[model samples]
Target chain A: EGGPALFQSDMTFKIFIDGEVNGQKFTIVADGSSKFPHGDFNVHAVCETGKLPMSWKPICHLIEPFFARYPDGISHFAQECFPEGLSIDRTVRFENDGTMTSHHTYELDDTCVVSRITVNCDGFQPDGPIMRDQLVDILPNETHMFPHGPNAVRQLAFIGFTTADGGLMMGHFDSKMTFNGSRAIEIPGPHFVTIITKQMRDTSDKRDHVCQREVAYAHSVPRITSAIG
Target chain B: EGGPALFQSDMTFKIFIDGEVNGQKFTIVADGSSKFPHGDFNVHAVCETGKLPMSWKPICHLIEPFFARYPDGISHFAQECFPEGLSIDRTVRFENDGTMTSHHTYELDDTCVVSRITVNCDGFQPDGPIMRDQLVDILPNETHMFPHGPNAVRQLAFIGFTTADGGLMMGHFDSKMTFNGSRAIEIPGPHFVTIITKQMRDTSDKRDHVCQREVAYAHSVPRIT
Candidate 1:
């Protein structure tokens, strides 16, 4: 087949959140690969399941509210798909105390379908009492039940970062573990804004890190003039 | 005559020492200044009278060797130059500790010159005392002197930055109090080699005095080239 034309489109996404459990508000922007412009294909999702260690505070403070206000509930849209083009399915639920337990399945497209399921537990015994326990890493599209490998499942949470311009640029920390279900999980809202000025690009001996050595390139989305559907 | 179309010609600077101080051999790299190229410059000059506070040790360390190793002796030259030529000068003399003395001078060309004359005195004083002798700021041109209003002095010991592209850069201590000489003066020879790392930038902060901020580009010297 002789092809004469190939077209590419872009998309934009903005995420905002608001709640108590130390009520807070936050916003994130992501762009699309095609059909979306001026942004990246990244999504930051935040959910509070329970309390374990406080290390996940920074990520939660920055992501929680968006999952709460989106209406499709944080886990609903991923559970079902709409036949009508571009319509989002809404069938999810959330608790006021910042605890979210749900399953989401989404047919992102014909080829890329993803399902996400999350559960919260009490706490993890990391090394000993002196050490802290937290989520190490996440394997996509998999269920990690109780007595998770490496350590026992304590409390769990969810946080995501998506840039509509480039796609998802950061990781998530959406789970936690408590000692037992006796104590209530505390989710503190974002309280401070940090403005980073000069970060040392090199160590004391002047050796550059991996992040500093990467070459950064700028990409722009083309403007399209067409009638709206 | 349009300046007679001056052709590029080589000229020699024959320096002379007026007193009984010795001369030293110095490794002179191209201080990014053509006037003083990368060659040996024998230093054997002196300022008989001078004074400074106790905190001016490093400055004395930089210039002391140049003075003690006058004439045939050799040493290393570290530092750079500004729009003017060399920022540091080496002179000769004897320190009071039976060791020789060397004079380190900071200059701004023909303008004012700040000189630090260091001599090793006998037996370390537990309580460092101040040197109170008045040595006038002098240069090759008798017309140049001190108090030229800040930069007027041809040499400044503790001021200015060295360009990264090989210029004359000198390090010194910030001593307080106007110089006044005391009768007890000791002269020692074979001065200690003053080694400084990049950490010296915060020396003034450690002392009560504040140092001037540097305003030049850094780490641009072509070490490989």
Candidate 2:
């Protein structure tokens, strides 16, 4: 048989977005209760360093990253939430790496997944320039989805993107919330190559499959636009 | 982000279970329409000729293989169908291989997933037997799931198992539904080593991401048992 997907039983998730936006070094730490897929979910963020460009804030929310919305305001998460047939085409630029191009089409009436051809080009770089655009398809509901229940510490998502000025942004979301953020991008100040880490300690108990139990608290931290002396 | 899992458009899937049950060499071939995750799914089978002991009917079904049900009366397909909290533990034995052991725990109240561990052992064999019961967690909804759209074809599910006589029963389910069914089980037939094959033809069109359109038809075939 198949294994489990996302589950319940209380969850704790942490997200960190660290990189450069408009030549500004930024790091955002957000942690909350419950998994994003399952509701009653709340998260608060603190900008340890620089702020996000005002224009990029809308697309950076925990919910927005996990769920995609159509121009008509119809949002899709699980299999049933999508309309009969839908398609989306967009190209996301990355300064830390390169430009990523892809498209998506969904036929919900038949439980269709989003299909796209992702083309990534490092052509703009001064050194090595590479270009690749291949056809790829994946489930909309399954993206950025995590498994829960009893210490199920797994990676929620590892994403990298950029803003209008061609500035890069990336984050590591996980259950353990451990942070050892390092230099993730290859470019320089306008770049802070960083990494996020997670660990699992449920070895003693074998039955604790998909859920996790942990204490979650809110913090009074600086805003994304806030600066540290 | 995550690429395709399973898709729509017309699809073709094939499965073959070739192994030993009750000391008899057997081979099975089944193929059908659409994708397993999306309904309107139908399949036809041929023993290619080996008679299933007649006792293994209820456990194997195209629908049964895709969708799992609970004892109470509820069934789970997507995230919404499962009850609040559910747990299942069972051991599946394989004659062609060995015995498989595992347990599952689910929490659906909040879009829960079923989590469990799978442990397998080659303990009963005359050769050096080994045992592994490490804890592994994967998505139930994600399992046996495939990606489709405009010539998109991928392996739907690769599974191995056996029956009551410690007889082996394993099959390969894929979007292409290709078959060259091989000698999958080791200890010999009453065991017909078998395999299922698939291929993808969606290269030229980059924009056609996740759905696949193919022809699906029915054929006169035999029963599982």
Candidate 3:
């Protein structure tokens, strides 16, 4: 009742990401679907520029913050605004890397949900640019199948990418069975901000880019009953 | 004649710059004399804060490079390189601003010369940082004197800085002397990297942080060539 059972159902979703590096602009689109109780999610992502200097690994992680379907209750602020939706301003700065500040909004429609993300990098004119658009993917090409965890209540899948420069990029997927059809959720953007702020202040020597590859996938399941229930 | 006008004799130099922001670093150190035909410069810069958050104002325009004081036949590259020397290995990038890439190096001894600069932003690192050390005194405590233009053949000075919240900041100073025994120069550091890159890309907007409260000073006649 507490783990994988929180996400048992058939789900689908789509994601779009638009980004500008130096002065070149690019876009990425992905469609994904998964069967619940456990997750074997299949996702196909395409970039408008056709090729990215890095790899699909880093871009894969960009999905995590936008899709906040946590079985353990929304692990971010989006939970507080659940039933209703949540929207806020966000700023992400990368030294020698680049700075991207954006506005994020999330809303739930019945059993399906939609998210719109707009961003501005270094204040290049024509304000309020839409960087990403994600929605429920109703029809998916192939279905990913996962092994059933007889003993474990929840299940998780992860994939990693290695850059031509030898850098590692990774993504994660988690699922469980849902109790009812409650779509209440929390937003993960602010949570990412908190995580990044801590990482920035951390003086410990680490990679040039931390959290550069931390992205998550969106999953839909029936709502779960209260723990007490 | 290789080192500090160890030619000593009435030689003086000073630099003043004030900056406010985070993580970016740059520094400029130069020394010259009215007697010598040119000067020697030294600089060090760093940028740990990653991509600066604001528009490219403070970071653009920092590149005045070096002031070339030719006795007569000194062209740009050399005119720009001057007495001590110059080197290469430079890469600069900006979004809506300009971009400047140049390799920089220098040699010095006896006659006042020292130069060192390398900048790499966006995917480049270990070469450039945005940390700049500058001092401030609106009404500077010590005033610098320079000879008039007649005796001097050239003059130069520059300053730049931008903020994380879209604010522009900058400064500049230049002087020509009578060639008799006067020295004055401006040191632009990694700060120039930010400014130049922005300018290279900026086509629309005008200066939001232009000159600010730019100030210039001078010395008496004897100080003049």
TM-score of each: 0.16, 0.24, 0.27
- Cα error, residue B143 of model 1, in Å, equals 32
Better of 2 and 3 by DockQ: 2
lDDT of 2 by residue, A1-229 (tens): 0001222134444544443433445455555454423333344544555433322221232211222111112211222222332233334443344443333333322211222222222222333111111111111111122211221112232233323333223322222111112322111000011111111224553431112222211111111211111
State how far residue A39 of model 2 sits from its true place (Å). Answer: 6.1
lDDT of 3 by residue, A1-229 (tens): 2222222355454555666644667666555554442223344555556654332332333432223333343232323343354454444332233345545455554333344554445532221111111111111111011211221111222222222343322222232211122443322210111011011112452322221211232322221121211
Model 1 Cα lDDT, one tens digit per residue, B1-225: 111011012222212112121222222111111122212112222222221232222222232111111122311121212212222233222212112233333333232223333333323222322122122111100000112111212211221122233221222222211112222212211112211211111223222221111111111100110
What tens digits encode model 3's per-residue C-alpha lDDT throughout B146-216? 21222222222223333233232222222222211233322211000001111222122322221211111
Q: Candidate 1 or 2, higher lDDT?
A: 2
lDDT of 2 at B211: 17
Cα error, candidate 1, residue B151 (Å): 15
What DockQ does each listed candidate score?
0.00, 0.02, 0.01
RMSD of 3: 22.9
What tens digits encode model 2's per-residue C-alpha lDDT throughout B3-54? 1122212445454444343244445455455443333333444444544322
What's the distance in Å from true for residue B165, model 1? 35
Which numbered prediction scores highest in DockQ against the true structure? 2
